[PDB]
Design a protein around this nucleic acid. Structure first.
Ligand code: ZN
Lengths: 92, 233, 11, 665
DNA sequence: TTAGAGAATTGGAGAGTGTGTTTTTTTTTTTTTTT
DNA sequence: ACACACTCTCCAATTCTCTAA
């Protein structure tokens, strides 16, 4: 056989390398200021997510990363279990 | 106020001011990056003067222009025969006499593409000598392969010239004949110098490969060398 | 036959 | 066989010479044509070759033969023009039946050859083979017919009509009425022929104007000039206006609909109203060109392309990347964009209409067609007199036809009706917006109940069977009906018509429509947006409202709105105002903030608001920045109150009962 | 309204095949024989 | 025999459709 293809998958997201890093650091990473423009602060939010997206899965363009994440986010039940777990933690 | 674009700079002033004592060495060791940093600094300072002092001059005009630094008086002159492979990509100073100059050569800087079927057009940046042609036409409804094509006479070009510099007799070894080295010069400094002129120059000492044949990517082990001038005196 | 017009041709 | 084919071709050529020829005794250099004998049999046998052979075998080979031997250009036009000029001179003074017979039988062949072309999966392989070439030949026909003596053959055709206008309807035999249908059927074909559409077999993934044809020959502008000089517009205007008085409506009114469709098709109404001028706007456009040039310059390095050094960028966790180029040394934004741009992959992409010539439905209509000053004023005069004279009577007759015949319809007639309605209603609204001399009563037949029911029924039936082209066209028409209603309420029965227009069933349909638009072409989504704007505004000025607005607000509509908005580089200034009106409605008024916290919107505002995209001084930037400020303010508040939304921003919202309610609020 | 089971369309991995390659002045400085 | 240009083929990745809970 030819070599099988490599893909983004929910296992990567649920790994310690994956989504928990964002929730462990996002409160410290991003910082808005009224003292800078709407364009300035809007440009600031996407830095951390772009670098994180590259570190997670360097395959594809950034838009493709988001639009790929949409499918597995809607479909996979284990990922949805993790997400309801997050919002239950806030309900706690 | 005179509407001019180039600034001279004798490097010894970097040693006088305390904050730039180390920048002098970094200039000699890493010219390509440092000179670009200096250029973008000068342009920003020129904008800052008009906006801070709130003058009448057109901001768009200053934004349109390119500004360049031209360092000189870098240090001791170096003999033409004594340049060694450990001097590659460092700044150099030479003295000599001009033999001849070739006519101006057009050098491409920006490419222009046009779609054959839908007439969509794109301008593309040239870096490292390679044209980054698109894979498919980028119009959304005309996403087709092999669909763009180059239009030669709507590209943008720049001037290049080659000058032949000869060793002055003061340095020649005993019982030998003088040698020569080739200088590549661009834009402002193209047509400055004539046969028989005596000059001193300043530029990066470069080296590049050369192909074995025009058909294939096979390179030779020996490398060509030349000088890339940034100032003439 | 798989005939097809260039519907997207508008320049 | 090939020899049988060439035998028929040679038979057609010998018939193309038995027809007659000019006179060599004349000493007149050259004279006109001169007439043969057996010519009745020649024309009749040629008609038989079309009908009895080619149609029965479905070939178009016979048309290729007559095109080879150039019968139209060489014989038929001089025969008709000689008849016309002879009878014209006789009228100036103020067996002859046989001359008139030859005139009739020449015109019928002229209608037959220029008949427009249709291709399906049921057409023969012969016709599919011959489609591309007969298109070229019909283009030659259009040019030649409009050219001869500045188009004088068109005067013969209306004289044939005038013979049947002459005496009372009470006398007029069916064969008599067929002439009056035929003369308009001619003009429909002369307008309809236009440059070809390229078509190939999809076996492998890898212009048609002949050498004697050019655009200015074929443009609509030429047709306006040719029609005006040869006295056509008076004929159409007098025929349509007196249609009510006992011209048998059944024979005339559908072809007379097709004409009005066939040269309203490619006009924007703003081009007909102005709102050294050309040079002035050209200079302004050159300023815009300079701005684009400035944009390219701001990303251009000073020193040459081989001077460049190298750059290294270190992330958190001390990992390093590499990028080249001199501008990357200073601009981190450009470095970050350039880093991702090198990567190869793009996800491949999904794609709605076929079987109809080019129109508003499947082309970008931000591209005018261009008029001489005389042509502009003449065309304006024609359609203005048409509206002031003929519009209501024509629409009443054609609409009370179709209610009795809706089941039998074909897609052409539906799309024709729906794009005749829209054009004339919209044009009258704009003209009365401009000036007080015009009035809205000229187009008032559209509002009466039967036509409203019919447009509704077309939209209904088209949507149910998933026929999307008729759905698009019905969308456009229903938009114009709602706009006209909002005009008349700004001045009795109109409120009754509104209440019947907004029964709950129709609210279900009109709410359903934007959701499916996400998949389709750009024009479909734009139609959905404009219809939605009008629909919601009318129900705003009804004072029910809270029920209706909550019906609209949900994920798939927002998906369509963002998918449409990201192609802003192709769109108008006005559509973005409409989109941000809707976003204001969702975000501020309804306070359904949770919908828009999704990441692909945050990218779009960066792209659209940057120095890249929308102009620094266009009116759009006011709206965009004023929106983005409030958006990020509320987002700051939400994120600090509940840090879980950092992971929330990537994904759709979560529909679980117990956590979802607190998630949304 | 979600989701999962089955069918159809497309991409490009990668394997294969054929191909091309080495290789009469005219002007100007210098030595030599000839009248 | 050693880089190239071009052709051919198979296989699995992807989206679309139907069914039932
Ligand atoms: Zn294209």
């Amino acid at each position: 056989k030819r070599r099988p293809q490599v893909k983004l998958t929910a296992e990567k997201l649920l790994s310690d390398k994956g989504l928990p890093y964002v929730l462990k650091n996002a409160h410290k990473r991003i910082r808005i200021s009224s003292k800078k423009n709407s364009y300035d602060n809007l440009s600031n939010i996407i830095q951390f997510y772009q670098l994180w997206a590259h570190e997670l899965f360097p395959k594809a363009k950034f838009k493709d990363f988001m639009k790929i994440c949409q499918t597995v986010g809607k479909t996979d039940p284990v990922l949805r279990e993790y997400r309801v777990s997050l919002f239950r933690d806030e309900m706690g | 106020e005179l509407g001019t674009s180039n600034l001279n700079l004798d490097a010894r002033n970097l040693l006088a001011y305390k904050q730039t004592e180390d920048l002098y060495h970094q200039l000699l060791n890493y010219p390509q990056e440092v000179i670009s940093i200096m250029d973008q600094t000068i342009k920003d300072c020129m904008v800052s003067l008009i906006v801070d002092n709130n003058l009448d001059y057109d901001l768009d005009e200053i934004e349109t222009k390119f500004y360049k630094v031209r360092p000189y008086n870098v240090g001791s002159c170096k003999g033409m025969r004594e340049l060694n492979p450990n001097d590659i990509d460092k700044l150099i100073n030479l003295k000599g006499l001009v033999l001849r100059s070739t006519p101006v050569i057009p050098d491409m800087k920006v490419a222009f593409f046009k779609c054959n079927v839908c007439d969509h057009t794109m301008a593309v940046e040239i870096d490292r000598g390679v044209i980054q042609e698109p894979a498919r036409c980028e119009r959304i409804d005309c996403n087709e392969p092999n669909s763009m094509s180059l239009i030669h006479n709507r590209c943008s070009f720049a001037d290049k010239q080659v000058i032949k510099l000869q060793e002055t007799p003061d340095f020649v070894p005993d019982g030998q004949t003088p040698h020569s080295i080739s200088l590549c010069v661009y834009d402002e400094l193209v047509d400055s110098c004539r046969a028989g002129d005596r000059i001193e120059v300043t530029g990066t000492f470069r080296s590049i490969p050369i192909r074995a044949n025009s058909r294939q990517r096979v390179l030779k082990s020996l490398y060509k060398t030349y000088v890339d001038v940034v100032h003439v005196k | 036959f798989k005939s097809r017009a260039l519907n997207h041709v508008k320049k | 066989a090939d020899f049988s084919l060439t035998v028929l071709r040679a038979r057609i050529a010998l018939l193309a010479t038995a027809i007659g020829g000019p006179d060599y005794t004349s000493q007149i250099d050259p004279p006109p044509y001169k007439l043969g004998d057996d010519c009745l049999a020649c024309l009749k046998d040629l008609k038989r070759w079309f009908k009895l052979v080619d149609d029965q075998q479905k070939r178009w080979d016979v048309a290729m033969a007559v095109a080879e031997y150039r019968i139209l250009t060489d014989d038929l036009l001089p025969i008709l023009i000689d008849w016309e000029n002879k009878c014209s001179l006789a009228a100036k003074l103020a067996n002859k039946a046989y001359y008139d017979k030859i005139a009739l039988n020449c015109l019928q062949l002229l209608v037959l050859m220029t008949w427009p072309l249709i291709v399906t999966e049921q057409s023969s392989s012969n016709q599919i083979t011959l489609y591309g070439e007969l298109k070229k030949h019909q283009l030659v026909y259009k040019k030649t017919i409009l050219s001869m003596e500045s188009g004088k053959v068109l005067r013969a055709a209306i004289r044939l009509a005038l013979d049947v206008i002459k005496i009372d309807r009470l006398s007029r035999t069916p064969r008599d009425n067929m002439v009056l249908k035929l003369v308009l059927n001619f003009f429909r074909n002369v307008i309809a022929i236009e440059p070809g559409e390229f078509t190939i077999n999809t076996k492998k993934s890898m212009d048609t104007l002949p050498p004697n044809v050019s655009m200015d020959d074929i443009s609509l502008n030429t047709v306006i000039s040719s029609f005006h000089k040869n006295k056509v517009f008076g004929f159409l205007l007098t025929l349509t206006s007196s249609l009510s008085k006992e011209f048998d409506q059944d024979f005339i009114n559908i072809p007379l609909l097709e004409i009005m469709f066939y040269f309203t098709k490619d006009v924007n109404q703003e081009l007909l109203f102005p709102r050294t001028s050309a040079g002035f706007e050209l200079s302004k456009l050159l300023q815009k060109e300079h701005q684009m040039r400035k944009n390219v310059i701001k990303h251009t390095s000073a020193r040459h392309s081989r001077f460049g050094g190298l750059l290294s960028i270190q992330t958190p966790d001390k990992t390093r990347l590499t990028v080249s180029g001199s501008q990357a040394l200073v601009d981190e934004k450009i470095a970050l964009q350039k880093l991702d741009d090198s990567k190869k992959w793009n996800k491949r992409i999904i794609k709605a209409a076929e079987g109809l010539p080019n129109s508003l439905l499947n082309s970008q209509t931000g591209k005018a067609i261009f008029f001489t000053e005389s042509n502009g004023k003449h065309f304006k005069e024609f359609i203005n007199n048409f509206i002031d004279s003929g519009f209501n009577i024509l629409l009443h007759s054609v609409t009370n036809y179709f209610t009795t015949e809706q089941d039998r319809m074909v897609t052409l007639e539906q799309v024709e009706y729906l794009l005749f309605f829209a054009w004339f209603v919209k044009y009258q609204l704009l003209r009365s917006k401009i000036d007080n001399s015009a009035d809205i009563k000229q187009v008032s037949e559209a509002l009466k109940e039967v036509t409203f029911i019919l447009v509704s029924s077309l939209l209904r039936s088209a949507y149910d069977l998933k026929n999307w082209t008729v759905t698009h066209a019905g969308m456009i028409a229903f938009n114009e009906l709602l706009n006209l209603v909002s005009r008349t309420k700004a001045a009795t029965d109109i409120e009754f018509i509104v209440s019947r227009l907004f029964s709950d069933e129709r609210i279900q349909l009109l709410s359903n429509l934007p959701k499916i638009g996400s998949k389709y072409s750009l024009q479909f989504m734009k139609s959905c947006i404009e219809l939605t704007h009008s629909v919601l505004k009318v129900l705003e000025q009804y004072s029910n409202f809270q029920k209706v607005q909550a019906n609209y607000m949900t994920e798939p509509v927002i998906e369509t709105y963002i998918n449409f908005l990201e192609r802003f580089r192709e769109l108008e200034d006005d559509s973005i105002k409409k989109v941000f009106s809707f976003f204001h409605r969702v975000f501020v008024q309804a306070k359904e903030q949770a919908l828009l916290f999704r990441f692909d919107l945050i990218i779009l505002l960066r792209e659209m608001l940057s120095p890249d995209g929308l102009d620094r001084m266009s009116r759009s930037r006011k709206y965009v920045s004023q929106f983005s400020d409030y958006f990020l303010a509320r987002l700051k508040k939400r994120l600090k109150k509940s840090p879980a939304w950092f992971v929330g921003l990537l994904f759709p919202p979560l529909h679980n009962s117990e956590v979802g309610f607190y998630q949304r609020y």
